[PDB]
Amino acid sequence: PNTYDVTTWRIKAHPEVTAQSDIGAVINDIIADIKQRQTSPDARPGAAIIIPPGDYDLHTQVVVDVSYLTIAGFGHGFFSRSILDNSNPTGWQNLQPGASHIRVLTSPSAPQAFLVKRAGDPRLSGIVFRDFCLDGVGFTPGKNSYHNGKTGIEVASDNDSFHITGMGFVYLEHALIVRGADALRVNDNMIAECGNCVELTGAGQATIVSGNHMGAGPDGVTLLAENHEGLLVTGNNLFPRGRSLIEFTGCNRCSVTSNRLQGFYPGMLRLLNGCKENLITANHIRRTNEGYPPFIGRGNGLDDLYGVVHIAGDNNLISDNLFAYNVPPANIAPAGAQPTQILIAGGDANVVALNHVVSDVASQHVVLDASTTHSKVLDSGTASQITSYSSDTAIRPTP
Amino acid sequence: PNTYDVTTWRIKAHPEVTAQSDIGAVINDIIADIKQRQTSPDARPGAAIIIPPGDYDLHTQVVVDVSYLTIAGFGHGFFSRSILDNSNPTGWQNLQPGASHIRVLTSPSAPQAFLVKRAGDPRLSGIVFRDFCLDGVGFTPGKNSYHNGKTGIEVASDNDSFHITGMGFVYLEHALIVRGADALRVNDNMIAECGNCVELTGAGQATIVSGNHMGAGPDGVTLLAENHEGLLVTGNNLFPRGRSLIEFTGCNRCSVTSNRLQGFYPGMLRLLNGCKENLITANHIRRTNEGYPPFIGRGNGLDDLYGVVHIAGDNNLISDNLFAYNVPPANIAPAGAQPTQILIAGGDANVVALNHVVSDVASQHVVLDASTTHSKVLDSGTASQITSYSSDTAIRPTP
Amino acid sequence: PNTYDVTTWRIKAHPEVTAQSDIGAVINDIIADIKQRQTSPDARPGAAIIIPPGDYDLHTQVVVDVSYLTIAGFGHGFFSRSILDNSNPTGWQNLQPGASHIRVLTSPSAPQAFLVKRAGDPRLSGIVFRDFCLDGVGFTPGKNSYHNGKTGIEVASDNDSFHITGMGFVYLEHALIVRGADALRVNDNMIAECGNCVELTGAGQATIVSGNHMGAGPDGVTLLAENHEGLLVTGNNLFPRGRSLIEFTGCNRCSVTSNRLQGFYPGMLRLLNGCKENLITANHIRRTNEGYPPFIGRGNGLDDLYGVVHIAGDNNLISDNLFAYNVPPANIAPAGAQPTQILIAGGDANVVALNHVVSDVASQHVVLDASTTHSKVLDSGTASQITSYSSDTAIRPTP
Numbered sequence A, B, C: 001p002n003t004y005d006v007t008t009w010r011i012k013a014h015p016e017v018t019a020q021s022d023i024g025a026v027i028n029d030i031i032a033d034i035k036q037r038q039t040s041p042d043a044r045p046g047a048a049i050i051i052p053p054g055d056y057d058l059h060t061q062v063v064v065d066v067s068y069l070t071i072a073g074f075g076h077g078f079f080s081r082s083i084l085d086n087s088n089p090t091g092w093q094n095l096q097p098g099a100s101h102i103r104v105l106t107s108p109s110a111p112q113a114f115l116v117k118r119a120g121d122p123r124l125s126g127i128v129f130r131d132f133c134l135d136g137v138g139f140t141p142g143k144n145s146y147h148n149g150k151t152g153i154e155v156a157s158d159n160d161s162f163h164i165t166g167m168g169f170v171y172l173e174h175a176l177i178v179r180g181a182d183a184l185r186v187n188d189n190m191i192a193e194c195g196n197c198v199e200l201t202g203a204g205q206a207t208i209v210s211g212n213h214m215g216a217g218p219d220g221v222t223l224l225a226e227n228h229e230g231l232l233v234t235g236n237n238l239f240p241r242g243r244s245l246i247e248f249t250g251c252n253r254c255s256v257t258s259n260r261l262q263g264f265y266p267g268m269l270r271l272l273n274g275c276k277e278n279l280i281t282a283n284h285i286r287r288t289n290e291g292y293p294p295f296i297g298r299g300n301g302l303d304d305l306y307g308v309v310h311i312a313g314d315n316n317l318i319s320d321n322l323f324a325y326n327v328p329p330a331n332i333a334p335a336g337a338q339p340t341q342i343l344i345a346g347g348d349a350n351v352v353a354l355n356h357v358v359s360d361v362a363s364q365h366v367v368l369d370a371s372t373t374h375s376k377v378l379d380s381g382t383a384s385q386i387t388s389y390s391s392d393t394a395i396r397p398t399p
């Protein structure tokens, strides 16, 4: 009961339109049957749509408008399309992503493979997307452009208690987008080789983003949060080549702890447009130069004075972080300049303590811009590894 | 084999008693069939009971006495009954929780929907409860009382290697209770709008409580631990209105790290009755005033001198935490008093280092009561933001 | 489609060779059918093999050579064979592990129950092993030897995006082995009473090991990592009696944060053969004496001067950790010696800050060996709890 398998369900008016030819059409007809049956606001349990191991083409955008809908598969089936596209496929035993593999072949007018939204009142709640694969197939015009106008899963209406786990997102301009998230959970996923990985837009409350593997694109964000409060980002392994790896705009009282960050460009961790009272601690922050040839020479338009960690806001605590910076003197922007590990762009009362910096070149561990006030820097470098353009900055040298 | 679907299984002596009318009765008959079949202590693999998407009434308490029993569903189906009860339902498209929805309608004599217990020897092991929803339906006498005498899942006998994940608990006086837990795992769950969320009573060892979303009641605990050793509490997003958010009584060598805590009352983090050698670090602790009108004016009977974090024990390390305190001067208890972020009630050798406090009012970041001995306060406030009633306290100003 | 249940699938040439008698033979025939069917490198989605609740004997080693293969069960079914073997079984209601229980009865020539490997090009990707039980049955010659020459799951070829979750490993000389892991995920598992738990050999990239419960053997490792980069180890509860609990050899830029460590021997956390730029923070490290009689008197051949935490490498940051050391003066190796909490064996620029030590005996919180250069020790003990055999060590007393 209330359980469907995409491969056994026939579309009565269109019998040869299967999960293989258009799983999008198939899922929309299933959701139509769910609404068919559950007409009572007091009797709308939802349902589970299972996606068997296989290759499925999605031409028709799926509109999800039922609460507690679960779309699950048996695997994330990730496969590096990036390496395939930059390698010689001769004799290769695999040329594509697997598991419950959905190839997103959406039209411009309906970008998203899945678009969750509903009008009227109760906000959508309890929707779960798990253990299946969303593949954008390829990048266009350039094979390494990270552009293709497709989106995997997008939640456009305010949502409560959503759960996104065990997923596999690959080669999508936008993997996952969730606006107005509340008690959202994005954990144990593989989101990579996507222009953008996770975008929490609009605003948010007590959301959790942990245990995930992320890799974005030069012109995209890996993890982005807009006007969020209570966001916990922990135990994620964010690797190369978003424009940033963690980017908060105007979020307050959030926490970024126990994470692994690896970027090839300036501003891997950004706190923009007045982020207040956030905790950034116990994170490994490694900045280095792009190591995979196909992408050598690409950038995010930022120079090394932007800082690996960029803070614009008040009362944020950046501590107990390990900075490993290895970048060719010649790749350092501007010529002659000392790389900035932590830049306090503006704001009041920011505190920077116990941050170990390791770098191949002379670097300013912490820089407090002339706009900053009442900042505090403790055990984050010697006096000559710290530049304070403010005169009310309190500094304590690492002995 | 050894797999049942609650909707297809008929109770031989009682044919019209279905999962819909009494899933409790159904599950008990299934467990009876399991014991029927597995009579050999050397041949007792257990089984899996699947709960299809749907609305199910539970009148009869389920007694779980077989090891390695797995009761799974397809979703946590959380839905804010609290907001429904305090809003105008007209035209609402949903009035109830979904997914594998079990409405707990238990009788006083058998409170618990699920009661796991067994006599004799081997302790019960490997029991798994996952991906389904337990809903207490409503609160009684007051719709906002958080009282109703029902319990979701309770483990009364010593257990080994239990696993509780992907669940949905809502409107239950007691969501989850586990006595004598050993190598227990409570992760990736949504437990909210419950009088009490997770109660680890009796005693415990090497337990993990992480990646969970929890919100309790004024007269209840969010996460409670009794005489636990090796407890790890990490990556949880604990929000509003337990009497406390984390409460340990006599636990030793446990760890509370990388969490998001948000409370509306004093003592959000409590270490009572001599807790020794525990690590409380890298947590975001925010205390503020109740923000949802229906509950404005409710309390936990504690004043602001109890401290947001209350410690009674020895050698505990409270460090690298960010305290965000925003409370109306007029709501501050006692009139004229300065709020206490960290109170070291009693104990020896407690260490408080690198704790950033942000508050709208003059506040004592750390207070060491006259009973305390050999305490140490480092980089947690200026000398005037610290009150030591002891004389062996070692203090170092945040420059 | 592409979904098999091990109990319904007959081996055409060998009809009575069931999952019960040789699930190994069964799975190999299933994989043979998958390869039968998916001959196109462009059409190799993989499949899912489901293992129903039950007792299954594995005599034949399973060779997994298809990408995106998912082998899943309904439970980890852990059961302490150690306690059974050292107790009186009379009247016991369980004598063995449950859930989707696979008893590994492999022959010397094919140790591993599951051996994942493939020749040629694309590296194997997206393979998932979840929610089932691997039991080695017993230890041989000694019942408490932790030796039996069996291995549970071993990945010998370079792999990408593997996922190992919800598993149960018990009584195996080697539970899990994964060479050349990339974006690997080992989370939410129960690996205990195994000679060795998790072995990441060869080399690795951006791997995550979190939310796991581990206990190894005196002659084995709990978590081992070889030449790994970007390894994140977080939220794990590692308990008693590996020779070590976390052991890295030549890993760089990895992070071990927010973990619970409990050992009975020296060197619970080891950074060997030049590990550079690693973050070890926010961990609870408890060293004490073996508490279960059957194992009293056993050891790992290391003395108390090796240190509970042993570091040999450069620029590592060991901070915000809580050390609880309780060991009988008489069990302390060498007689008369002061236990070493943190030993910096050799290396340049290591930083040790904010580490709280609690011990029943006079102990050297930090020892910097004469080989070390430019080390830093802050707030990790008084000058007399710190031994620096170097002269360029910068030290700052815990006031």
Ligand SMILES: OC[C@H]1O[C@@](CO)(OC[C@@]2(O)O[C@H](CO)[C@@H](O)[C@@H]2O)[C@@H](O)[C@@H]1O
Pocket (backbone or CB within 6 Å): A080, A082, A083, A192, A193, A215, A216, A239, A240, A241, A291, A292, C182, C183, C205, C206
């Ligand atoms: O930088 C990681 C980035 O590159 C990809 C290839 O486009 O992975 C390639 C690889 O070699 O990079 C890391 C190594 O540093 C390793 O894990 C990879 O397997 C890509 O998907 C990533 O986004």
Ligand SMILES: OC[C@H]1O[C@@](CO)(OC[C@@]2(O)O[C@H](CO)[C@@H](O)[C@@H]2O)[C@@H](O)[C@@H]1O
Pocket (backbone or CB within 6 Å): A182, A183, A205, A206, B080, B082, B083, B192, B193, B215, B216, B239, B240, B241, B291, B292
């Ligand atoms: O304080 C959280 C508490 O209130 C509930 C309503 O009873 O959620 C309401 C809500 O508005 O509170 C938070 C914002 O502060 C937000 O996530 C909610 O959606 C409830 O379940 C919580 O226990």
Ligand SMILES: OC[C@H]1O[C@@](CO)(OC[C@@]2(O)O[C@H](CO)[C@@H](O)[C@@H]2O)[C@@H](O)[C@@H]1O
Pocket (backbone or CB within 6 Å): B182, B183, B205, B206, C080, C082, C083, C192, C193, C215, C216, C239, C240, C241, C291, C292
């Ligand atoms: O030290 C843990 C070790 O011992 C076992 C028994 O061989 O567990 C026994 C037990 O008593 O140890 C811890 C307590 O200290 C507790 O969780 C156990 O249940 C074993 O599996 C462990 O590896």
